[PDB]
PDB file of C-alpha atoms in Angstrom:
ATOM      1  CA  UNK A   1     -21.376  14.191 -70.423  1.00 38.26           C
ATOM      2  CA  UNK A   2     -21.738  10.105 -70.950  1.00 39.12           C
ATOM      3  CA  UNK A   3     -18.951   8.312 -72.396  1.00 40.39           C
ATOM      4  CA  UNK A   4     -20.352   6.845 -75.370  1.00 39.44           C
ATOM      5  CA  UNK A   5     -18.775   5.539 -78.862  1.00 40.96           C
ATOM      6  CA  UNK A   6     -20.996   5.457 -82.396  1.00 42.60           C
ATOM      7  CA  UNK A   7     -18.562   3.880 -84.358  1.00 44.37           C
ATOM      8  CA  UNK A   8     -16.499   1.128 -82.521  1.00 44.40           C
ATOM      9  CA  UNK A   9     -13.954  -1.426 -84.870  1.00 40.91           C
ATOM     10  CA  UNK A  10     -12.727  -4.458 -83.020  1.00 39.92           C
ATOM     11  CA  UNK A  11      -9.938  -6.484 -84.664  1.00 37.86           C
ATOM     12  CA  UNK A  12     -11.123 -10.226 -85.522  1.00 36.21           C
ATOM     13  CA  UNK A  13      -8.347 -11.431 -83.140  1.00 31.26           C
ATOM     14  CA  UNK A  14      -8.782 -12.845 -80.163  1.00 31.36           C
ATOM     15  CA  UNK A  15      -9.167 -11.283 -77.576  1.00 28.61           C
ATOM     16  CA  UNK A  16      -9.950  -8.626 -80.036  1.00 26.49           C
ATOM     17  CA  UNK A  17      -8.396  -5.057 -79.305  1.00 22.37           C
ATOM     18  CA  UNK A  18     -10.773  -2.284 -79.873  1.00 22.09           C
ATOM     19  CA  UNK A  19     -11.031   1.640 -80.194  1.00 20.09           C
ATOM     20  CA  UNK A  20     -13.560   4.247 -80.772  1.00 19.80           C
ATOM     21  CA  UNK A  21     -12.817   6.075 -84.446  1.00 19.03           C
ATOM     22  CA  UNK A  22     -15.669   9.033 -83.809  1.00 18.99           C
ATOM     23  CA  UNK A  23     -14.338  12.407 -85.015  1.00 17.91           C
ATOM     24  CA  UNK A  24     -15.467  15.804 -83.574  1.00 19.53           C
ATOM     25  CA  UNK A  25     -14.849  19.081 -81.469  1.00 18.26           C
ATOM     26  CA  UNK A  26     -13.534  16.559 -78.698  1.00 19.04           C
ATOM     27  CA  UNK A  27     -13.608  13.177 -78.059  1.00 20.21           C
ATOM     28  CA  UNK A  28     -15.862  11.532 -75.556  1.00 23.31           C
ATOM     29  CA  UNK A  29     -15.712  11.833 -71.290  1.00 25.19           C
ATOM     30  CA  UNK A  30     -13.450   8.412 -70.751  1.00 23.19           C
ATOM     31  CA  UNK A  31     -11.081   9.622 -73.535  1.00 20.83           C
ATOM     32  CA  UNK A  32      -7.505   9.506 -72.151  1.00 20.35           C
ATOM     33  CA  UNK A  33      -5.397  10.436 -75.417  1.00 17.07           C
ATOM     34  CA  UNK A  34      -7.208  12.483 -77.358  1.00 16.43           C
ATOM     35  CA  UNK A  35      -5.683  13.554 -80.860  1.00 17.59           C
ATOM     36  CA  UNK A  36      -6.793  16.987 -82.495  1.00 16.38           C
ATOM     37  CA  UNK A  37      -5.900  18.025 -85.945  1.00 16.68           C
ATOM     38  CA  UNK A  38      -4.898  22.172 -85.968  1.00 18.47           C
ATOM     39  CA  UNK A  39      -7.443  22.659 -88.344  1.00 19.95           C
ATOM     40  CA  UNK A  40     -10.620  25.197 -87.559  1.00 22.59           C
ATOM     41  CA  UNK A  41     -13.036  23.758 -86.748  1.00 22.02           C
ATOM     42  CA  UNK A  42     -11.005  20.768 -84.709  1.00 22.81           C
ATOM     43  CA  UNK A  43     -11.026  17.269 -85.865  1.00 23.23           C
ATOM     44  CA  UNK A  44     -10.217  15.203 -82.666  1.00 19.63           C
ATOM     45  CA  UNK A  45     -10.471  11.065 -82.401  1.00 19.58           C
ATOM     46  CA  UNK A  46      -9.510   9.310 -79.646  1.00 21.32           C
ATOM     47  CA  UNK A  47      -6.966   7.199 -79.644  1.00 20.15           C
ATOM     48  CA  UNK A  48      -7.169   4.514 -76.608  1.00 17.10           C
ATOM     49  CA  UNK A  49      -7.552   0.889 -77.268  1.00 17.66           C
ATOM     50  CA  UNK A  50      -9.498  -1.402 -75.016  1.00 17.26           C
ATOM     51  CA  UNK A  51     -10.997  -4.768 -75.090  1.00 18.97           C
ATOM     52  CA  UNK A  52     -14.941  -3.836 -75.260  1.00 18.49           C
ATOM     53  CA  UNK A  53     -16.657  -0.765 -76.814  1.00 20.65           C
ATOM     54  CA  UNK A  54     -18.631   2.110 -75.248  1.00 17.39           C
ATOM     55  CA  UNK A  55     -22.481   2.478 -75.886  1.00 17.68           C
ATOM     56  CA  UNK A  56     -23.612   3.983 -78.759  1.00 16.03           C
ATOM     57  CA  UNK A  57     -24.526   7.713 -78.416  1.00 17.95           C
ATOM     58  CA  UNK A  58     -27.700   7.637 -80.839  1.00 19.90           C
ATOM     59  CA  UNK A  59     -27.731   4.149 -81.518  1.00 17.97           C
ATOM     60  CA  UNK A  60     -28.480   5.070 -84.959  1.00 15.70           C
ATOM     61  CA  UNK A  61     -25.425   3.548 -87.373  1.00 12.22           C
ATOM     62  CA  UNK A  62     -23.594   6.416 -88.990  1.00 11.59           C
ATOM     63  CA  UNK A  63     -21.142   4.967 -90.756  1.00 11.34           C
ATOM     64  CA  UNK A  64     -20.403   1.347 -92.305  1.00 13.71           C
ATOM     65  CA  UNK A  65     -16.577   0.027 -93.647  1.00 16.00           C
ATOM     66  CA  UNK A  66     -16.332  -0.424 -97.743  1.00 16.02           C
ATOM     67  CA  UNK A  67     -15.512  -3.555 -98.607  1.00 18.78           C
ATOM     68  CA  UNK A  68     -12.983  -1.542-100.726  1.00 18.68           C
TER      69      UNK A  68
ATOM     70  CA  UNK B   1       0.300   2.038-106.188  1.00 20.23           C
ATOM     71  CA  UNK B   2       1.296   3.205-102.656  1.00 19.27           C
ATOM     72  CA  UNK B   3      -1.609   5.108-102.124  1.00 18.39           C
ATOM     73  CA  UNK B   4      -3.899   2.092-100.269  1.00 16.44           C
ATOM     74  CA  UNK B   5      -6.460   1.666 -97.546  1.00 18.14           C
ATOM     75  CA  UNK B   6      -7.331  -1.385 -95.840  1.00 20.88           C
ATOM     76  CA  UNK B   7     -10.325   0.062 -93.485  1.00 20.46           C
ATOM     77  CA  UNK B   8     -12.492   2.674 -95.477  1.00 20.27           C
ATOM     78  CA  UNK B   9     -15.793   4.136 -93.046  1.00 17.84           C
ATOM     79  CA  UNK B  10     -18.081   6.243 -95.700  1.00 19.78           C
ATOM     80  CA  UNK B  11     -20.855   7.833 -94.105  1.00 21.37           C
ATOM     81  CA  UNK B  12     -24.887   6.138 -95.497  1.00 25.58           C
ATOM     82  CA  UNK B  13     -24.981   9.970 -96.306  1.00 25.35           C
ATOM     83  CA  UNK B  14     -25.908  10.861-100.118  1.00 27.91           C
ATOM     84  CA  UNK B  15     -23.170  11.718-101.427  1.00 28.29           C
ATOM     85  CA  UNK B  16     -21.243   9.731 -98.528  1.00 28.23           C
ATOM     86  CA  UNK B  17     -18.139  11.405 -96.561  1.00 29.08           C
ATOM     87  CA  UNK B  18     -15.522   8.822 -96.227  1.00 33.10           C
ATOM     88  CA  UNK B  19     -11.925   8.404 -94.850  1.00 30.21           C
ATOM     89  CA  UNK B  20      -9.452   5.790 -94.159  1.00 29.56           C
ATOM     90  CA  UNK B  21      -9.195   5.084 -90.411  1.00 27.72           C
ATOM     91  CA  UNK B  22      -5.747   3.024 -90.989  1.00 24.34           C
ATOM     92  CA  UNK B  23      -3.341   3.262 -87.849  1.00 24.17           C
ATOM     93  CA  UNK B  24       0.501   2.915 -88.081  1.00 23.83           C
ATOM     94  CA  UNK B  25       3.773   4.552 -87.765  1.00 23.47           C
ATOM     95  CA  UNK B  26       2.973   6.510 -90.790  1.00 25.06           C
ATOM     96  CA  UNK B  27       0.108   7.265 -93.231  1.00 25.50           C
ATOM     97  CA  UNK B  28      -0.330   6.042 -96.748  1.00 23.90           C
ATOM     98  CA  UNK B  29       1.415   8.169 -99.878  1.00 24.22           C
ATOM     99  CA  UNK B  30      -2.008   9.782-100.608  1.00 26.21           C
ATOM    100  CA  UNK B  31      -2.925  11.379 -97.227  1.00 24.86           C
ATOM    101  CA  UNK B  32      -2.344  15.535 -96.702  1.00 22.99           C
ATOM    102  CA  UNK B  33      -3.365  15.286 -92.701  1.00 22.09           C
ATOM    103  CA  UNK B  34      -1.555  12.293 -91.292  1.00 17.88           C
ATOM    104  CA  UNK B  35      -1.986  13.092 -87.416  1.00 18.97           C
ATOM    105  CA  UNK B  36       0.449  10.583 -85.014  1.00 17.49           C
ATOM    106  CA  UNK B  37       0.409  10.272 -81.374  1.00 18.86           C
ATOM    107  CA  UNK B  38       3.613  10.773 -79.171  1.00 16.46           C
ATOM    108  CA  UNK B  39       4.331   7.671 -78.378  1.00 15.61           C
ATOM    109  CA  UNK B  40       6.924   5.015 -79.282  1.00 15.80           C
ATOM    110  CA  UNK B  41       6.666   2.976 -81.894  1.00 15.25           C
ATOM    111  CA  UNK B  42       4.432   6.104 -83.115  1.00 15.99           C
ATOM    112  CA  UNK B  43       0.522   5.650 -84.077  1.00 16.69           C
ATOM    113  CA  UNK B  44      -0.261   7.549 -87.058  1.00 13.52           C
ATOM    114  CA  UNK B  45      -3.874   8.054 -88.966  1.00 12.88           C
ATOM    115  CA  UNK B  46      -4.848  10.077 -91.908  1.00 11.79           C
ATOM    116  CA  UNK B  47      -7.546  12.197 -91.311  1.00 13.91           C
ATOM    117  CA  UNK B  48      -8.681  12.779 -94.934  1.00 13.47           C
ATOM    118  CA  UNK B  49     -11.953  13.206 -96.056  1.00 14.72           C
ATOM    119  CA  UNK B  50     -12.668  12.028 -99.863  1.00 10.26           C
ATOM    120  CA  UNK B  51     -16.089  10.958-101.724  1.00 16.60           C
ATOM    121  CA  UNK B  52     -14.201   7.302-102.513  1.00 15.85           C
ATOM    122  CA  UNK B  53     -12.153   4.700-101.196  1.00 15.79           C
ATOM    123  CA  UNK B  54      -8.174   4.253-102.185  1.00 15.26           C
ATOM    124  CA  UNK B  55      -7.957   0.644-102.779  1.00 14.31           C
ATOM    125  CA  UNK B  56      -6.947  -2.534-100.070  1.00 14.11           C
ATOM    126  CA  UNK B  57      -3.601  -2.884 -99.456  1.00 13.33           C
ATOM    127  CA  UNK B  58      -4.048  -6.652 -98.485  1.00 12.41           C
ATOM    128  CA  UNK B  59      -7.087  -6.943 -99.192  1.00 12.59           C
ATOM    129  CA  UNK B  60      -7.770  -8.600 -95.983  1.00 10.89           C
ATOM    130  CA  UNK B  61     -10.202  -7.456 -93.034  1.00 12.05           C
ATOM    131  CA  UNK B  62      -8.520  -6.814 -89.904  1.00 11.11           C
ATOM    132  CA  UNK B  63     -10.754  -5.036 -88.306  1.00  9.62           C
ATOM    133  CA  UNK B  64     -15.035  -4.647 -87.986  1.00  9.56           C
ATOM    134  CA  UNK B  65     -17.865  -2.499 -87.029  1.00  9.31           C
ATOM    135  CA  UNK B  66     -19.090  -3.888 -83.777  1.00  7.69           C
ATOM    136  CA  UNK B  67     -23.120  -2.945 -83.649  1.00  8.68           C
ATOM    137  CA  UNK B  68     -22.504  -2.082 -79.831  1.00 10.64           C
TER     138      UNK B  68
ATOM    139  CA  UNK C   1     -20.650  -6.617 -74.440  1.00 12.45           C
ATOM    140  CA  UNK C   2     -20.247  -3.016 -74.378  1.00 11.05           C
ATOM    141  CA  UNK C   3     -19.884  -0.658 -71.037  1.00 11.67           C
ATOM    142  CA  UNK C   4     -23.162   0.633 -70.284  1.00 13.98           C
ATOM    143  CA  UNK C   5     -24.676   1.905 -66.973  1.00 14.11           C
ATOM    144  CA  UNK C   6     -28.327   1.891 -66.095  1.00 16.92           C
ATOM    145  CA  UNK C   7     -28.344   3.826 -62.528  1.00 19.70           C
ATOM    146  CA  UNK C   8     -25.579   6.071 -62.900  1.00 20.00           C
ATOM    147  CA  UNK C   9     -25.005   8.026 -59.287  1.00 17.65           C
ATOM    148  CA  UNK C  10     -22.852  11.357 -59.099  1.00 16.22           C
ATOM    149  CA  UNK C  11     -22.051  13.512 -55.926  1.00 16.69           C
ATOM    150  CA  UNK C  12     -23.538  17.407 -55.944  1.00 19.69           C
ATOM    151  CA  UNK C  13     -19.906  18.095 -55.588  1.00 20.10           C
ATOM    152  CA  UNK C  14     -17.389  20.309 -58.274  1.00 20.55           C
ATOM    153  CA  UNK C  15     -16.401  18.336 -59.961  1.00 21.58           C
ATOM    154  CA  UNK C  16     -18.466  15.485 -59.109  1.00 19.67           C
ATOM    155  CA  UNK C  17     -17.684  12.097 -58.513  1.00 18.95           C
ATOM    156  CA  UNK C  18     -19.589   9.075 -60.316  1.00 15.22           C
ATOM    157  CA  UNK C  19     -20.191   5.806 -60.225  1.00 13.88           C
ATOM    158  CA  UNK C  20     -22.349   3.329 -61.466  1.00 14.92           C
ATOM    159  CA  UNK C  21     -24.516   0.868 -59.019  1.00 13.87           C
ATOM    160  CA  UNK C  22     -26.120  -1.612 -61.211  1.00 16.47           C
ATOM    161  CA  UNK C  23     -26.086  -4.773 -59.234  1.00 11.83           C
ATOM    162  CA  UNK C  24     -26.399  -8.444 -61.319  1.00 11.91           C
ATOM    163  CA  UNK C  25     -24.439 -11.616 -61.603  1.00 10.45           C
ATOM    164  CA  UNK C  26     -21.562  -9.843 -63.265  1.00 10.46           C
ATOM    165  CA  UNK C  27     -20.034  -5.595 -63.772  1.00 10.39           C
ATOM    166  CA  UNK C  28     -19.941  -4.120 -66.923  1.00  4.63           C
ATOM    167  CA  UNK C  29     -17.090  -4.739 -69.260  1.00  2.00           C
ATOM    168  CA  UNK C  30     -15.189  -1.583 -68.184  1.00  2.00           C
ATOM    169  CA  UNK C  31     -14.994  -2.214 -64.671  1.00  2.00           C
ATOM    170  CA  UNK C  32     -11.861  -2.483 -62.616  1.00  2.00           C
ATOM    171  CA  UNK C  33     -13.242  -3.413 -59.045  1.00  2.00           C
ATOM    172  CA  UNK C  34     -15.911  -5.611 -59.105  1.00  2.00           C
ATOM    173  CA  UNK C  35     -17.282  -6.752 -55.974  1.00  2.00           C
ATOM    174  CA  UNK C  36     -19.788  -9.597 -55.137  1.00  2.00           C
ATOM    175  CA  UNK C  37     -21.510 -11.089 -52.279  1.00  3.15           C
ATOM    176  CA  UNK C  38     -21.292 -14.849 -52.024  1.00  5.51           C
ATOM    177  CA  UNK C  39     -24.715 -15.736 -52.438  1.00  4.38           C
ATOM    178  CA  UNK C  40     -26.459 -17.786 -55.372  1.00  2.66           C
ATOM    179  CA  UNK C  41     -26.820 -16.517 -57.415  1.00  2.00           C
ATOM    180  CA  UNK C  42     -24.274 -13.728 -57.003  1.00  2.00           C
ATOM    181  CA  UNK C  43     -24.809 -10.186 -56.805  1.00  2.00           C
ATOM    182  CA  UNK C  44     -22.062  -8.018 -57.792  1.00  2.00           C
ATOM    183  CA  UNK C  45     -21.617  -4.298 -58.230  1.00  2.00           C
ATOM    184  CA  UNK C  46     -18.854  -1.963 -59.822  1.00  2.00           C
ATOM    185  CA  UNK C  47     -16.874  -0.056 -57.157  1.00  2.00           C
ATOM    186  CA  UNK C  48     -15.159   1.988 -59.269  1.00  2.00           C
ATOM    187  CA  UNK C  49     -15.896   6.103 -59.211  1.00  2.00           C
ATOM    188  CA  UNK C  50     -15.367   8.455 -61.915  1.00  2.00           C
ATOM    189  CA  UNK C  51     -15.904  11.699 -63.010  1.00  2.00           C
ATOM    190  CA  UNK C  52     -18.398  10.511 -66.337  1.00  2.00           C
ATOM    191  CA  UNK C  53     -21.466   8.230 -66.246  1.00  2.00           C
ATOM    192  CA  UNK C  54     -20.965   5.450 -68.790  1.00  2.00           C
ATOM    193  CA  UNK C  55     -24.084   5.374 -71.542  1.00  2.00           C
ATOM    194  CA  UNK C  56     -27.296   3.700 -70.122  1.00  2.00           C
ATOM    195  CA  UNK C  57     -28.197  -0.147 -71.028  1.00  2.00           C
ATOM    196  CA  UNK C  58     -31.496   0.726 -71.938  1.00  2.00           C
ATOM    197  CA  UNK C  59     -32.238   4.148 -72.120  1.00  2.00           C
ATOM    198  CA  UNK C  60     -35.145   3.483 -69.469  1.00  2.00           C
ATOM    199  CA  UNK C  61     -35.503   4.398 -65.709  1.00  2.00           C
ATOM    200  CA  UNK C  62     -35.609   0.935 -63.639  1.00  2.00           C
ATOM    201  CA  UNK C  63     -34.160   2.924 -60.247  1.00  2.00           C
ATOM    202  CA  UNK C  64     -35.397   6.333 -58.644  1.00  2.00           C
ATOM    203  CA  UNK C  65     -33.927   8.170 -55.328  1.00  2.00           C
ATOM    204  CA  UNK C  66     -36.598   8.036 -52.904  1.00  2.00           C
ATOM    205  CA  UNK C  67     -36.286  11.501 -50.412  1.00  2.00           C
ATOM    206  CA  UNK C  68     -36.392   9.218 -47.341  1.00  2.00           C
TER     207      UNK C  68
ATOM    208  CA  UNK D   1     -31.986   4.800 -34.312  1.00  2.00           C
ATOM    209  CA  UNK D   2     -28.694   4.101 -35.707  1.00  2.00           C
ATOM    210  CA  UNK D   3     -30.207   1.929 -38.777  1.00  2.00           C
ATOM    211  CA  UNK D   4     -30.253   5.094 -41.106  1.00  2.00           C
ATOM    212  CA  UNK D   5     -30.201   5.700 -45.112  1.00  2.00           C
ATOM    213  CA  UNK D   6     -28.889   8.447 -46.912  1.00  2.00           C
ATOM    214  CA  UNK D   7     -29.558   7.657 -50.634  1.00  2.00           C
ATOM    215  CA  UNK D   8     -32.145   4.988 -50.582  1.00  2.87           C
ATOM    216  CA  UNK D   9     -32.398   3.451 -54.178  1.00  4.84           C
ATOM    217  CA  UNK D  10     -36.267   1.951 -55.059  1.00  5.21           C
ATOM    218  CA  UNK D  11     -37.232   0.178 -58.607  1.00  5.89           C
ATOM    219  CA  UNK D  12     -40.378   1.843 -59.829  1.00  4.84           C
ATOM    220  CA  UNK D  13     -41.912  -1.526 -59.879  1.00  3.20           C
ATOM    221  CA  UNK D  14     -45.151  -2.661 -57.834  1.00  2.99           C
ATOM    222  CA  UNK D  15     -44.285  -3.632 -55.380  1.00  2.00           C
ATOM    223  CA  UNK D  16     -40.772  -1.582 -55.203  1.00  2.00           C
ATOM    224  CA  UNK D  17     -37.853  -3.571 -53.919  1.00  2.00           C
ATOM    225  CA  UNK D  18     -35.337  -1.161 -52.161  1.00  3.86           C
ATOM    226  CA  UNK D  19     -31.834  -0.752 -51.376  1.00  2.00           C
ATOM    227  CA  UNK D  20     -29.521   1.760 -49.329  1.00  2.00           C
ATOM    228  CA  UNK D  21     -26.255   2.559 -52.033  1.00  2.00           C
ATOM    229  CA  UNK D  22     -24.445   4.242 -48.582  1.00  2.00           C
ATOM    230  CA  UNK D  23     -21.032   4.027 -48.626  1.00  2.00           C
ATOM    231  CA  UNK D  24     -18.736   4.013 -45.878  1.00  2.00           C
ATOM    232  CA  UNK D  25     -15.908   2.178 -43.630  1.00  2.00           C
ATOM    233  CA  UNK D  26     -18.760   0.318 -42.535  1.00  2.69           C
ATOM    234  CA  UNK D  27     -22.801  -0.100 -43.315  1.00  3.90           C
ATOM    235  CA  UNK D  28     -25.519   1.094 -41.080  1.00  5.13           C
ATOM    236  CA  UNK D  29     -26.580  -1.111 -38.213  1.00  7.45           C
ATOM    237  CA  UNK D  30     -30.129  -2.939 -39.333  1.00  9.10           C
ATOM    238  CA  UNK D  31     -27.157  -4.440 -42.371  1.00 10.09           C
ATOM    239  CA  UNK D  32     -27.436  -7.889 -42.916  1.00 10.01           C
ATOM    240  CA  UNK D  33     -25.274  -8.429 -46.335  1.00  6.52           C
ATOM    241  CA  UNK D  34     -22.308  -5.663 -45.668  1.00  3.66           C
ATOM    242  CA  UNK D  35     -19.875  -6.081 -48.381  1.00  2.40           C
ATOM    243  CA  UNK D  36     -16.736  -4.136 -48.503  1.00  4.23           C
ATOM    244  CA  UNK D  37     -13.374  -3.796 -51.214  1.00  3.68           C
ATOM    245  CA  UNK D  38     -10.214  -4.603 -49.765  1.00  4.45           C
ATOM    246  CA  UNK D  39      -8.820  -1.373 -50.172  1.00  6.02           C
ATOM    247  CA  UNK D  40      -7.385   1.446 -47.159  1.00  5.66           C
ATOM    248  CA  UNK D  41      -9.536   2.628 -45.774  1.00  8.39           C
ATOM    249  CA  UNK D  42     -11.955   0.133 -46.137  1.00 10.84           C
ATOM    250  CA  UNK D  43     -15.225   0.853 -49.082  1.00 10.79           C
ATOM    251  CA  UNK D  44     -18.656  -0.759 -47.590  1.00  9.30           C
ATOM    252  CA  UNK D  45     -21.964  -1.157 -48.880  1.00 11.31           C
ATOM    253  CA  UNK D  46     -24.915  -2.692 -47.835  1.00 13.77           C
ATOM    254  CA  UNK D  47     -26.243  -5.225 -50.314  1.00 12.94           C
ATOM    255  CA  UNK D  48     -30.223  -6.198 -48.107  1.00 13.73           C
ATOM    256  CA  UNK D  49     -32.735  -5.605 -49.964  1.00 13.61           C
ATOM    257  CA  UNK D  50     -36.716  -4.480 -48.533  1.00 16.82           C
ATOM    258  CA  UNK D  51     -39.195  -2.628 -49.409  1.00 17.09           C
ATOM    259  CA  UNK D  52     -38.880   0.471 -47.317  1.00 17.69           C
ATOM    260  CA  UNK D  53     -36.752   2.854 -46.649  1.00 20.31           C
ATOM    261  CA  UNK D  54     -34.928   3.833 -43.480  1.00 19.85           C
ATOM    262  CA  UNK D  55     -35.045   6.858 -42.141  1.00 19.58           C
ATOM    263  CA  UNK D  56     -31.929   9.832 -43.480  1.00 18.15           C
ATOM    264  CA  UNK D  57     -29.232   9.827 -41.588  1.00 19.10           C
ATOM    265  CA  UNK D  58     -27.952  13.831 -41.749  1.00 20.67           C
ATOM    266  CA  UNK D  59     -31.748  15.052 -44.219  1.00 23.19           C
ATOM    267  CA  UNK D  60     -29.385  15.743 -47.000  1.00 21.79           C
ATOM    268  CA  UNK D  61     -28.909  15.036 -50.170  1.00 22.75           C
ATOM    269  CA  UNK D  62     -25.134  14.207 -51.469  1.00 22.99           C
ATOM    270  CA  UNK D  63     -25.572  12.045 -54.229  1.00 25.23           C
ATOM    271  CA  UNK D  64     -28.349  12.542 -57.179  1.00 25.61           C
ATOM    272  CA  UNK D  65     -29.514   9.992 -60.348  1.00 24.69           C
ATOM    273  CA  UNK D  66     -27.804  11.257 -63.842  1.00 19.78           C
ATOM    274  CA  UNK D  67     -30.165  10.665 -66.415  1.00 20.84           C
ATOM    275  CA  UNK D  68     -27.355   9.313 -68.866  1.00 20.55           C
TER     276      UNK D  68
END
């Protein structure tokens, strides 16, 4: 399919370093390490780090971070 | 006490679905499914799912939801 | 910004290959050869080929293959 | 004659503005603006822009538009 990212988290460094912390069946088409959980159904997030984020996928914010 | 999360995503769902997305060579004292990559140093994430968030560990933000 | 592709082009082929020829005065943040022509202002496009098209820009057809 | 385009690429604007995205050791010969990557073999593409097409060069169709 499209490589695309809902929920991207940059650092606040500079340059920042950033990932792509969606969870699913797989991870997305420009994935290259892709860690799965053995669990049924798989829980897979991809772990690569670059210094921009993918295009949504929906474009519809799914999830937010806590101020916890 | 050890049990701490620095970057908690919850879902905008009702109830909300949340997890800490912390990376490292290990998971916090709390976490059942802490999945690592093979790599050295290792990167490690727990990939728990819990209605709450633990709380901060430094309570500082390294990291932010880029609206891409 | 974020990697995003308007006019994404892939081969017929198995598997295909892809690649994405938006031209403009600068390549989207995820490409490794980016090639310009020295006018002003520039006009640059992404030379790089995949097998994925990255997520549109704005989810709205600007380019169509004409059957010349 | 020789001045031929596979995959010519038109905006659906009024009027269109066109482009031939052929690739190739070198760019057809009605090419003003042929830009090429420094790689072996060479990677050309014809950056003119008109609106028209030229004629095919071999009637078929090797490269489609991916609706991403």
């Amino acid at each position: 399919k499209s490589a695309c990212c809902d929920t991207c988290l940059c650092t606040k460094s500079n340059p920042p370093t950033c990932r792509c912390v969606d969870v699913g069946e797989t991870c997305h088409s420009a994935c290259l390490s892709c860690i799965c959980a053995y669990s049924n159904p798989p829980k897979c997030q991809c772990f690569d780090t670059q210094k921009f984020c993918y295009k949504q996928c929906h474009n519809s914010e799914l999830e937010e971070v806590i101020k916890n």
